[PDB]
Amino acid sequence: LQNEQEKHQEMRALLEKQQEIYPHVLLRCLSLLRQAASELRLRAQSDIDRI
Amino acid sequence: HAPYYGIFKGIYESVRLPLYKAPESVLSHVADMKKQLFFLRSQLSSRSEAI
Amino acid sequence: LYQLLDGDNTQKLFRTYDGLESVAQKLSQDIASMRDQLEVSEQEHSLLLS
């Protein structure tokens, strides 16, 4: 029981670390897609297609 | 039938200590509960900061 | 036991057994309340991630 409780605490610590890193990685992806949509598709490419 | 049985029965139930446990365990158990409270507060603060 | 639960060396001149049971109930409630807050915080976090 004591060993399983220690394992539980370790797993919990790891889970908390992963929950801290995951949202930041999603935000970086969102930031890249936003750049592609706003700077490339709505602006750069739209001007090119018009000309 | 001990004079203080009813009072301590109430204390054991309040701290969620089983009645079969030895009376010498009550202070150690309460100390651990306090330790847990500190840990939960620290976890909440860390998580609130992370969010 | 009373010192361990109340923390506050407030030299209360008269310690009662009823007071002792109340402070013990408070600790249990504080832990339960903290666990509930953590659960809420976990939901908030999960919503943000979704």
From TrEMBL, chain A:
This is HAUS augmin like complex subunit 4 L homeolog.
From TrEMBL, chain B:
It comes from the Eukaryota. This is HAUS augmin-like complex subunit 5. The lineage of its organism: Eukaryota, Metazoa, Chordata, Craniata, Vertebrata.
